[PDB]
Design a protein around this ligand. Structure first.
Ligand SMILES: [Cl-]
Ligand SMILES: [Cl-]
Ligand SMILES: [Cl-]
Ligand SMILES: [Cl-]
Length: 124
């Protein structure tokens, strides 16, 4: 079974680019990160910063998670992100995603020793 930290890295880190290149970014990345295997994952955010900068968020601003838990942290700085969301023309297989690039603070839930991101809660 994939660890929670590893799952977060696979689903949410893309340090290899500064920003989404084009409208096809999400179709490509959703497929390659194995987020369209049996079902199209409806919504997924990728962060275009180093792994270290995203891990560092777990020692930044402690804020409530949407679900009321208190292990969420909000990045002090904005980060380059891409939100990927299925479009109306999407139907498994042949998932289809809209790509929206933005520069926003991220909010992640953190757990473990080391205390690292295990869920992407939101962007602001
Ligand atoms: Cl793994
Ligand atoms: Cl791990
Ligand atoms: Cl997400
Ligand atoms: Cl990097």
């Amino acid at each position: 079974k994939e660890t929670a930290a590893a799952k977060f890295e696979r689903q949410h880190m893309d340090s290899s680019t500064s920003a989404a290149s084009s409208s096809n970014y999400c179709n490509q990345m959703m497929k390659s990160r194995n987020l369209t295997k049996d079902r199209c994952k409806p919504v997924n955010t990728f962060v275009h910063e180093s792994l270290a900068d995203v891990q560092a968020v777990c020692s930044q601003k402690n804020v409530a998670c949407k679900n009321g838990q208190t292990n969420c942290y909000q990045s002090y700085s904005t980060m380059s992100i891409t939100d990927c969301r299925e479009t109306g023309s999407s139907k498994y297989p042949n998932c289809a995603y809209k790509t929206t690039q933005a520069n926003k603070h991220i909010i992640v839930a953190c757990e473990g020793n080391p205390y690292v991101p295990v869920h992407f809660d939101a962007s602001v």
